[PDB]
Amino acid sequence: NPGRVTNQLQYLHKVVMKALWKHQFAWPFRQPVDAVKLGLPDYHKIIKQPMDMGTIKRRLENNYYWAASECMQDFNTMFTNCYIYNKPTDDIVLMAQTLEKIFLQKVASMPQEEQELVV
């Protein structure tokens, strides 16, 4: 019993996740950072909690979260990892920023009170 179905979590899956997934800047974030593929032997030394959209999607779809706040924290971790690891002038930082602005816009219109759904 890791989590529940709530109104806010279904909103995050349908409105937030689907929208970010399809975005033209989403491709670097759809799978975990592969440090071997990218030749970044220090990545896991700097970033201790990797996160990506694929993992968040799996967690949503397998009812992993108990509350929407937990899912929002995973999105935040994905973005913050990017800002912390990469150089300020790297394009990936601008791509993360673009996606995160959309995330915040959609979160501002999330259903206000979280209620467990009968399923």
Q: Per CB under 6 A, which of residues 49..78 are in contact with ligand 73B?
A: none
26, 87 in Cβ contact below 8 A?
no
Q: Can you tell me whether residue 32 is helix, strand or coil?
A: coil
List 85, 102, 107, 114, residue binding ligand 73B (CB under 6 A): 85
List 45, 91, 101, 116, residue binding ligand 73B (CB under 6 A): 91
| Of 11 and 79, CB closest to ligand 73B | 79
65 marked among binding-site residues:
no
Does the footprint of ligand 73B cover residue 116 (CB under 6 A)? no
90 marked among binding-site residues:
yes
* CB atoms near residue 17 (< 10 Å): 20
Binding mask 29-48 for ligand 73B (x = CB under 6 A): x---x----x-x--------
81 marked among binding-site residues:
no
* Distance, first Cα to last Cα, the chain: 14
Binding site for ligand 73B (CB under 6 A): 28-29, 33, 38, 40, 82, 85-86, 91-92
